[PDB]
Amino acid sequence: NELFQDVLNGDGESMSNTCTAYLKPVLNSITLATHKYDEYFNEYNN
C-alpha cells in the first residue's frame, strides 16, 4: 500500500494503475492467506 501511494503521488495516477496491476496477483494471494489465517483463528476462538 505504501508503494501504491508512493507511485500515486509520484507519477500522478498515469502509471500507478500499471504498478498496482503488476503486483495485483501477489496482493490478492497474500490477502487470501491473511483471510484464511483470520478465518481459522476465529474458528478456533469459537
CA dihedral 31, 37, 40, 45 (to 10 degrees): -120
**Among 1, 12, 13, 44, which residue sits at the site for other proteins (rule: CB under 8 A)?**
44
Nearer to other proteins, 13 or 41 (CB): 41
14-33 mask for other proteins (x: CB under 8 A)? -x--xx-xxxxxx-xx--xx
Cell of 3: 508503494
Number of residues that bind other proteins (CB under 8 A): 18
Q: Is 40 in the site for other proteins (CB under 8 A)?
A: yes
Q: Which of 40, 27, 30, 25 is closest to 1 using CA atoms?
A: 27
